[PDB]
Amino acid sequence: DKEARRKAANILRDKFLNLVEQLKKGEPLVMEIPMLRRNFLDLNEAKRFMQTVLMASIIYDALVSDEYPTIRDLYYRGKHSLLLKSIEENTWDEQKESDSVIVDIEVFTSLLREEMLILSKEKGKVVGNLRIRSGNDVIDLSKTGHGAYAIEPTPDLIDFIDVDAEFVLVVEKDAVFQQLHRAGFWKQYKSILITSAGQPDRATRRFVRRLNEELKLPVYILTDADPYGWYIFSVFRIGSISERLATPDAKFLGVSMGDIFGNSRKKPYLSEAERKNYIIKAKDADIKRAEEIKNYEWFKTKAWQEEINTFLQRKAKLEIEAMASKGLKFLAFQYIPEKITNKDYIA
Amino acid sequence: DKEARRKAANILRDKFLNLVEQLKKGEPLVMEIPMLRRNFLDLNEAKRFMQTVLMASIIYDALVSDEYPTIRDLYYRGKHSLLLKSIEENTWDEQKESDSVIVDIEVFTSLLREEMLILSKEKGKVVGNLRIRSGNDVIDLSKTGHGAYAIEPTPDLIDFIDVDAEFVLVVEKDAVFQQLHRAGFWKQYKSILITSAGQPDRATRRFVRRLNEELKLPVYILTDADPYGWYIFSVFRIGSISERLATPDAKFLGVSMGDIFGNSRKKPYLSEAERKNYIIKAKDADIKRAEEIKNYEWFKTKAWQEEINTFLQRKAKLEIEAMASKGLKFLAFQYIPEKITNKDYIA
Amino acid sequence: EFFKRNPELAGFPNPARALYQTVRELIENSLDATDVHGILPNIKITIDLIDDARQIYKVNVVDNGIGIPPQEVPNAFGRVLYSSKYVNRQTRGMYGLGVKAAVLYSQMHQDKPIEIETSPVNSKRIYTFKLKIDINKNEPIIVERGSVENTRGFHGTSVAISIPGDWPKAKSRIYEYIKRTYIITPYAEFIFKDPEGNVTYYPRLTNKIPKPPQEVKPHPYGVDREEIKILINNLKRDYTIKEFLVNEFQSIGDTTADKILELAGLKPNKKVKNLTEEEITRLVETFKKDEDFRSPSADSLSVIGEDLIELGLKKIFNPDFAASITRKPKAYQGHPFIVEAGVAFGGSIPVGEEPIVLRYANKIPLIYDEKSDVIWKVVEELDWKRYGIESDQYQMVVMVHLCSTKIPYKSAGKESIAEVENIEKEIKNALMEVARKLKQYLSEKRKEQEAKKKLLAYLKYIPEVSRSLATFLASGNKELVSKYQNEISEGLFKLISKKLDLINIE
Amino acid sequence: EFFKRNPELAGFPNPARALYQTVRELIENSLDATDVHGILPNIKITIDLIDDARQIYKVNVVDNGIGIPPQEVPNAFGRVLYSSKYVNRQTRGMYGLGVKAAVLYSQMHQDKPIEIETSPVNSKRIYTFKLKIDINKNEPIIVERGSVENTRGFHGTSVAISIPGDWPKAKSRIYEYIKRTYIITPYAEFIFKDPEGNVTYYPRLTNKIPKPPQEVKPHPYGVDREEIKILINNLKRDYTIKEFLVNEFQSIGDTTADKILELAGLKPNKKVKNLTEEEITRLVETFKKDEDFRSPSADSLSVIGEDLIELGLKKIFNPDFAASITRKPKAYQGHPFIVEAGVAFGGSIPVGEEPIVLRYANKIPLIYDEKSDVIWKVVEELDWKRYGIESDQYQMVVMVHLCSTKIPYKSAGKESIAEVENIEKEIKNALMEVARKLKQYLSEKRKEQEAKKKLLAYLKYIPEVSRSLATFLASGNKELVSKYQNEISEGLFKLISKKLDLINIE
Ligand SMILES: C[C@@H]1C[C@H]2O[C@@H]2/C=C\C=C\C(=O)Cc2c(Cl)c(O)cc(O)c2C(=O)O1
C-alpha cells in the first residue's frame, strides 16, 4: 500500500539502468566522472572499473528486488564468483575501498545513496510545531510526550503540511536538548528545536537544509567554546571532512568568546568569579586545530576570523553545560531570546 | 497543567528532606551507606561528607525550584563560596569525583537519579503495537512513519495502555533496525522491536526491564559473534562495568558460533563458501577479553561457557551485517522465526 | 722499669699517639688542681713546633689552680712511682705513672729540659724550675732553681714539655678531647693554640661547680693481705685489734665488730703490732664472707649533674629537646659507683643512619676503642622503635657517664670499659629512664601537629555543610542567612568534643 | 745478439714467465701448421717435471700438421734470425725470433738436448733429430739424426724442449691460454697434461674451418729504402723499371704507373740493376705522397667468423643470449685490417660489478697487460646504460678481435695494442653494432613480460564486468546466463585490439 515510496523505487531504476548501460558495441567505451574518465582499457584503471560496474549492479538488483540494503550489507559481496584463474586476489579488500566506489557511482548518476534507497544508519531527534506525512501516517511533532520523533534515514520521501515557527534551532548536546524541551522553549518562542547528537549524521542534515530551503526558515545552531564546536558547525555548512545538499548560511549563536569576556562595546554573560572556575584552560594540542581551521577557505572569508584568534589569544574554552548550569530560566528566557533578537551571532 | 509529573516532584522532596536531615543536636551523627558509615568527625572522611551534603542540597533546591538538572550542569557547582580561609583547595576537582557522590546519595535515599529528576542523556529508539501516555499526550507506537519514538530520560513516569505482542526484540545496530523495520517484522510476528545504539544507555534499560516485568514479555536480543557482542548482553542483565533495575533472564539469540559452523546435531546457517570471506579472523588482543569474561560470575554459571571456548578455539567472528547481507527475506522470515520457535538461544 | 722496653702498654706506642697522650695527661691533672678545690678553672693549651727536621713539639698547660708546695717539685716529676697506692677518693687519671711517663719519654729522644713554674695559694713569690732526670737510679737532677716577684693574687702551675710526635696524624683526634671535655665541664674556660696558629676559645657558660669528692676510710669487703699490712706499719701508736677493726674501716660498730672477732677467732684486747702472717689471713677470709655490711659510701664520689649535662650538650648541639638523669648510687666489690645518662634530639644535630655515642668515665672523655665498650653494646643493642623513632635515618645523641674509685677496664690499658654484669644493668635502665622521656616529647610533637591538621581542615568544612544543611530547612529565600549562622556556631562547638581552642587565622 | 743481455724484452724476464712463453710459442706455431693448410688440428700439450732441485720442465707439443722438409730442420731451430722479413700474409706470432728463442734459452741454464720429430704429408718414414746449438758463430750442431718406419697415413711435428721455470707462479695464467684459444678456434681438439698429472680435454664442436689467408704483392704506400733493395737483388732476369713498378706491387696499371715516372722523374725503359742510392729515394718519396691508389687488398687476411664466435662463446659460457659481428675491411699504413666483435649475456655467466673482456690479435689470445690496451679503454669508457643495463652488478662478456699484417703494439713487446686513432674508431663502432643488439633483446623481454601481465589480469576481469553488465539488461532471472556469454566472448575479442593470442590456462 506503499506510495511516494514506490515513486522512487521507479525513478531509481529507469533513470539509472540507462546511464550505466553503455554496451554500445560499435567502439570501446568508458565512464565519465565529473567532480576524469575511467578507461576499462587501462592497467592502473582496469580493476577500478569492474569494481564500479559491480557495486553498481548489486545496487540495481537489490533495487528491483524490494530489499533495503545497508552500506556494509553491500561491502559483504566481496568475492562474487568461484575462481576461474588458478594463479598458482579479491574483488575488494577493505570497506574503505567499497565506499569510494559508491561515491563515484553516486556522481555518475546524480543520485545520492539515500535516493537509490541504500538506507544507512541515522540518529538525531526533532520536535516542534510541525506536521508531516511519513510513509502512511501523519505524525504531529508537538504531541510527543517527553520523547521526540527521530527522522528516517531516507528523509527525502517526507511531506510537509502545517508549519508554525520562525526559526529552527539545532543543538548539539542531547542532554541540553532534553532541557530546552522540558521547559517548552519551542512553544513559547514558536520554533522547531532539533538536536543532532555530536557529529551531525548524513541526513539529520538533509532534513535541516530542507526546512531552510523549502519553508524559508532561518537556522541558528549552538555548541562549545572550543575548536571542537567550530567544527560541528563546519560540517553543517558542507558535509564531513571536505553533494551540494548541506546548508550554507546557517548561523552560529554562541557560545562566543565575548560571550564570556565581553567587548568595550558589549556586556559579558559570565560573572568574573564563575568564569575562574568554569573555564577549562587550553591544552596546546588544541591550539593546533584552531590554526588549521583559521585557514579553511570558508572561515578565511569572514571576520569569523576575529573570533578565532581572540581564542588563539586567551587560550580558554567552556562547555555548554557550564552555561546552562546557570539554570534553564536564564538559558530559556534570556540567553537565546536576547542573543537572537539582538543579532548577536555570525553569518 | 503537569500531572503524573508533579507526582514525583513531591514524593521527591518530602521523602528526602527528611532522610538527609539529621541535625538532631543531641549526639554527633553520620550517614549510613549500604551497598559502611561516614563519620563527619574523621579525617580521611571529613571532606567526603561536605561533598555529599552539598551535591545533595544542590539537588533538593533545584528540585523545588522547577529545574531540570543534567549531571554536568551539577558538576559545575564546584567552588560555591568566597574564600573564608587564606591558606597562604576546591570542593570537587573532576567530574568523576562528583558522580560518585551522586551514586552514594542515590543509595542513602533509595531513589535513582531519574526519580529525583536529574535528567541525563537518553538515546535508544522503539516501535511496535504499543500505546502509552507520556506527560500530556498518548502517542501510538505503530503509527510512526519510518521514524520511531525515542524514550524520555525519565522513563518511569510513562503509562502503558493497550499492548499487543508476545516478545520484545532488542537489536544493537541502528542500521539493521531500520531494516527489520521497513519490512514490517514487528507487525507480522506481533512484537515490539527496539534498538539501543551500541552500548545500552542508562534508561533504554529501564524501559526494557519494565516491559519484561510489568507486562510479562520475554526479551531476546542479538549482536555480533565477537566478545564485543557478549558484552552488550552483559550490560543488559546488570548495568555497565560491575541498582537492581536491569533485567536478568534476558535471552541471547545469535549470532552463535554454531550459527556459523553447526553441530553434528544441527545444520549451519551459512554456506561453506561465504564463510571463508565474511569471517574476520581473530586478533590476539581479542582472545584476551574472552578469557576475562569466561570468568565473570554470571557466565561461569551456565553452559554459556560452551559457546565461549568454541570461539577461544576457532578464533573467528562475524558482523551482524554480514548475515543480513544475505537479504531481509532470510533475516526476516527465516532467521528470527526459525531460531525463536526453535529454542535456539541461551538462558 | 717496665715502660722502658714495653712502651705501647701505658699509651706511648708511636710518635703521634704520644702527643695525644701527653695532652690529655696535662689537662686531666690541671683540672683536678682547680675544680676539686673549688675554683672556676681557666686552662690554656698551646702546642708549638720548634724543629722541622726531627718533628719536635712543645705541649704547654697553664692554669689558675693551687700548685705544688715548692719542695715537692722534684719528687713529683723525677721520681718514678712503682704503684698506684690504693684509691680513697675519686680522681681523674688511669694508671699510677701518669704525668711522670711524659717526662720520661721526653728524655729518650730529645735533649731539652722541662720548664716548670708554680705559686701556691696566697704565695709570696713565683718559684721557677727547669728539670731533667737520672733514669738509672731513680732520682731527679735540678738544672735550675730560682724565684722572682709575684704580681698580686696570682696562683698557678705552668708545665712545658717537649716531645717528638706527628701533629697531622693525631690532630683531628686531639680536637675531640678539648671539645668533649668542654661539654661535661661548662664551668670552665679553655683556650687552645695549635702549632699552625689556629686559636680556639670555649667560654664559661655558668659557674655552678659541683660538689667535690671526699676522701674516706677503706671498706672491708674490698681489701686483702697486702693492704692490711701497710695500714698497720703506717700507724703511730699502739692500737689494739679492736680499735683497729673499727676506727680504720667503713662499717664497723661496737656489736657489729665483736662478731668478726668471734669468726676469725681472735682475742679482742691484743696488741696490733703482734700479728703473725697466718692470723691476718684467717681474718681476711671472714672479711670476704661476712654477709651484712652496709653500702660502700659514695661521699668519695663526684657527679656531673642532671643540668650541667643538659646545658653542656644544649649549648653545642642546639637540639629541639634535651634530657638527662643521675641515678642513685649502687655498689661493686667494696666500692661505690653511679651512672649518669642523657640524650639530645633534633634541631642542628646531623641527620645520619645511627646515633652518636659519647662515653664518660670519671669526668673524662674516652675516645679510642668505642667499639669494644660495654656501653657501645647497650646503646646499639637497644631497640629504638619501642621508643618513638619511626624513621630509618635520624639525629640522636647519647651521653653515658660511669664513675667510681674502682673502674673495671676490659684489657691492658685500652681505653674502654669491662662487661661487669651488675654494672651493665644499672647502665641499661639508666638509658631506658631517658629513652622513655625523649619518646614523650616526640609523642607531643605528633599531637601538636595533629590539632593544626584537623582544626585547620574543619574551619573550611563547617561553613559548607552549614549553608547546605540550612537550605534544607526553609525553602524560601529568607532564612538562608538566618538558619546559616545559628548552626554554624552550633556546629563549631560540637567540635570542642575532642579538642578545645579559639583560633582566628587571617 | 741482443737477447743475450737484454732478455726481458722478447718475453723471458724470469724463470716462470718463460714457461708461459715457450708454451704459447709452440701452440702458436703448431696451429699455423694445420688450420692454414686445411686440416682439423689435434694438438696435445704436456708439461713434465724431471728434476726437483733445479726446477726443470719439459714442454711438449704434438700435432697432426704437415711438418718440416727434413733438410730444413737445422735451419729452423739452430739458425738465429736477424729480422722479421716483411710480412705478406697473415700469420700467428709476434717478433721475428719466435720459436728460435726458446731453444736459445734452453742452452743457457740446462744441459739437455731438444728432441724433434717430423714426417711430411704422404711421407715414407719418420725422420728423428736431437739438436743442440753453437751460439758464438750461429750454426746448429747435429747430435743425432736417424729414421724409422711410418705406421701408415701419419704426418706430424713433435717438439720437446726443456727449460727452467716456476710452474705454480704461472699455472693459473697458462690455463687461460688453452681455454681462451679454445673459444675462438672450436674446429680443434686440445689435450693438456700438467706436471702434476691433471688432464684436460676440449673436444671439437664442429669442423667449419674458415678460409685461410692468401699471400699477396707488397703495397706501395708501406715500403721504403731497405725493402726496394731486396726486391731487386732477389730477382732472376733483367726487368726494366717499368715492369718493375707494375708487376711487383699492388695497384699499378699502365696509365696509373706512367705518372709515377713523371713524378720521381725517371726514364721508363731503363735497366733496373742500374739504380743509384739517391735515384731510389727520389722514388720512395713520390710513393709516400701520391694521392689516389686503391685499398690494400685484404685477401692476405683471415677471420674468425660471425658464427664460430657465437658457438665458441656459447658452448662454454651458456648465456641467455649471444651475438657477434665482422666488419668490412679498412686500411692502415699500406696494410689492411678488420675488427670482429661479440658479446654474451646472462645465463651461466658469473654476476659481478664489471664486464669480462677477452682480447684477440690475429687469432691468438692476449693475456698480459689487459690494463694498457686500446681495447680495455673503449670497453670501460663505453656508457653501458645508453644500452639497456639497469643494474649495478651484471653478467656481460665482450670479445674484440683485431687482425692485420701490421699490428701496432704499444711498447717494447708487452702484449697489448697501440692507440692508433683510425683503428680505435673501427674498434668503437664495432662494439656499438653489437651493443645495440643487446638493447633489442632486452626490449623484447619487457614486451614478452608485459603481455602475460595484462592478458593474465584480464582473464580475471572480463567475466565479472560481463555478468554485472548483463544483470543490467534483462532484470528477469532468465537472461542472466544468456546475455552473460554473448558478451563475454564479445568483450574478449574487443581485447585483441592491442595483442593477439588464444590461451588456455588450467
Ligand atoms: C698540687 C696540684 C693539684 C693536685 O690535685 C691535683 C692532682 C694531681 C696532680 C699531680 C701532679 O703531678 C701535679 C701537677 C701536674 Cl703533674 C700537672 O701537669 C699540672 C698541675 O697543675 C699539677 C698540680 O698543680 O697539682
Ligand SMILES: C[C@@H]1C[C@H]2O[C@@H]2/C=C\C=C\C(=O)Cc2c(Cl)c(O)cc(O)c2C(=O)O1
Ligand atoms: C714446417 C711446419 C709448418 C710451418 O708452417 C708453420 C710455421 C712455422 C713453424 C716453425 C717451426 O719452427 C716448425 C714447427 C715448430 Cl717449431 C713446432 O713447435 C711445431 C710444428 O708443428 C712445426 C712445424 O711442423 O712447422
